[PDB]
């Protein structure tokens, strides 16, 4: 409602770097807010795409940002009569970024890995890797839970059980308030998808450079399955955390699996031991239900609510015709131990091929009325197809079904404006939570500052 679309702030990265593909707010040890931006096609030392991360200090005028440097060199370790190899070419560093406390986690989901042993090998595959930084101290750590040292023959003999070779760890990421990093790995267990969790503190204290294959004992990975409903489900394409079991000592996981059960799609809520508490099934095959997930209490009852995006949902129209527009689903959490019912609200896009619901950002309480609000991105929506972000205000019954405000992309065609969103942080310290919108196709990020309400809705 009260985001200012007149005076924006623009940050920009190098051309072709996909700056803005992922972003997050970052607070330093003094509570000063900055913006961390992933640029997954930033050039590296060998003039080859490797990805990069930028840490943007808040400035009303925006501009260029300093790099957050990570080791971009391929590594080789000859140990235990084996050769361990990391491959960082086209790894997509910055394809996801997240901030927790004074730590930044930037992941390279397509970093490759191989183990050589005489004439045999593990196979050069995208296990993924995440890079951890404490910018103020310069500390660096890595986390790559799907690296193994098993040879190809063994996986074949065992019918590819517990095959983590194609995890793409860090595809999606989130950090619990207690500091547990939770990585989505949609390619884990031969494209079933897995989750990898470990405390940030333990990642740092157990990492040393050059080891390549080390133990993080407090880590916890999800489980394999023989059930074909999970095959090629990309469980972990998106991840989120929240409180859904009423016990405040446990943290619950929200996992998106947009191709679950032959592309029907699903979203699952789990406890920290990966036991399934709820499953929300998609409504329409290939709609990519679970592409994006969001957790926030929208109706002010203290209980977290779930939002699910299905950006390829095809809406039914006259004369038995379908129109791909995208859809968002709202599930209000019921009082006490009960199942999430049918959706409380359906939000459906209007622009053909707009992909409404590709990203969903909690905004906090934007208009300061007592109910939390959300922003939904249609990265190719709007009457011009340039991209659009729509704000929906919370209310006692859930959300308003019509948007209170629409942000039209200030960028040219193809910018994918909205593909990444983050809100609920006051970056200029004016008392209102603000919104950052990435447009990786234009290699830019737009900052929308919230201002006092003109008059309320």
């Amino acid at each position, epitope marked *: 409602l009260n985001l200012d679309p007149v005076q924006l702030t623009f940050y920009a990265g190098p051309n072709g770097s996909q700056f803005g593909f992922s972003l997050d707010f970052h607070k330093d040890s003094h509570g000063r807010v900055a913006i961390v931006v992933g640029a997954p096609r930033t050039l590296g030392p060998s003039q080859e795409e490797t990805g990069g991360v930028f840490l943007c200090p808040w400035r009303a005028e925006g501009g260029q940002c300093p790099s957050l440097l990570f080791d971009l060199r391929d590594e080789t370790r000859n*140990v*235990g009569s084996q050769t361990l190899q990391t491959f960082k070419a086209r790894q997509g560093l910055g394809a996801s970024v997240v901030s927790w406390s004074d730590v930044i986690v930037a992941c390279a989901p397509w970093q490759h890995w191989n183990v050589l042993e005489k004439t045999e090998e593990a196979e050069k595959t995208p296990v993924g890797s995440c890079f951890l930084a404490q910018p103020e101290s310069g500390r660096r750590a890595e986390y790559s839970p799907c690296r193994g040292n098993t040879l190809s023959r063994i996986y074949v003999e065992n019918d590819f059980s517990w095959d983590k070779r194609y995890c793409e760890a860090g595809f999606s990421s989130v950090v619990t308030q207690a500091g547990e990093l939770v990585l989505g790995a949609p390619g884990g267990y031969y494209f079933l998808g897995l989750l990898a969790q470990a405390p940030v503190a333990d990642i740092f204290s*157990s990492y*040393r450079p*050059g*080891i390549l*294959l*080390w*133990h993080v*004992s407090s880590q916890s990975l999800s489980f394999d399955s023989s059930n074909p409903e999970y095959f090629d489900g990309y469980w972990g394409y998106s991840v989120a955390v929240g409180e859904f079991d009423g016990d405040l000592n446990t943290t619950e996981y929200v996992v998106g699996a947009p191709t679950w059960s032959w592309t029907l799609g699903a979203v699952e809520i789990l406890d920290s031991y990966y036991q399934r508490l709820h499953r929300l099934r998609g409504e329409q095959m290939a709609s990519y239900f679970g592409h994006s997930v969001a957790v926030t209490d929208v109706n002010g009852d203290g209980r977290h609510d779930l939002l699910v995006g299905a950006p390829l949902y095809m809406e039914s129209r006259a004369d038995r015709k379908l129109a791909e527009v995208g859809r968002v689903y709202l599930f209000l959490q019921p009082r006490g131990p009960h199942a999430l019912g049918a959706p409380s609200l359906l939000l459906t896009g209007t622009q053909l091929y707009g992909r409404f619901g590709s990203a969903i950002a909690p905004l906090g309480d934007l208009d300061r009325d007592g109910y939390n609000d959300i922003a939904v991105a249609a990265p190719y929506g709007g009457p011009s197809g340039r991209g659009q972000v729509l704000v929906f205000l919370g209310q006692s019954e859930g959300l308003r079904s019509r948007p209170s405000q629409v942000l039209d992309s200030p960028f040219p065609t193809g910018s994918a404006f909205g593909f990444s969103l983050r809100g609920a942080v006051d970056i200029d310290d004016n008392g209102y939570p603000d919104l950052i919108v990435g447009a990786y196709g234009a290699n830019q990020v737009a900052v929308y500052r919230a201002q006092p309400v003109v008059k309320a809705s």
Partner: antibody
Amino acid sequence: EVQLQQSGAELVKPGASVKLSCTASGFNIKDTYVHWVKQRPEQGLEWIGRIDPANGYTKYDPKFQGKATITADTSSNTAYLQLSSLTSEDTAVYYCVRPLYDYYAMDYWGQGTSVTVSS
Amino acid sequence: DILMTQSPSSMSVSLGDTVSITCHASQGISSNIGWLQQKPGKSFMGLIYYGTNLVDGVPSRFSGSGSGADYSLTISSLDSEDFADYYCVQYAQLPYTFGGGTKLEIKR
């Protein structure tokens, strides 16, 4: 806290067999490689072999092929070292080892199990 | 098999001294070396892994160095407990192999 608790001292006769145990305390035996090392005063320290208790795959020094058989039971969180056709030169202290962080390192050691082979 | 020549077999030193134990391998092992301590009549304790990294809980007066085929364990300002046996172990190749050892003895 990681602790590797090994079985009590053994006193056996030549030609017989013995099975030493190494039970994990404060951690899951399935987490890391588990090695077995032999120590004698003159001959020093010799690496016998290792096992991955998660899957049972083993590796040995060819010197110990035939005499040493390393197994593991994740249910009881224990790793074993079976020695067969015992001789006087099998009289030694035997340690089970696991790494801290580096997959291939040798950092945590059990207290050792003394083996004495005599008629 | 990789031969580990550890030198010296023994040394008679005093409290507060800064001593160094070397280990020479028959071929390159690129820091894939560990250092071990065995106090008299007791079991082993890890000191160093991967050439330079202190095992959790080891005092910083211990430090490892070296590259290629030559490495060193250095104890700065010896303590009373530091008088014990020390061994190196390579894990660059299977089978793992150990050094002959080094016993730190009190000088008088």
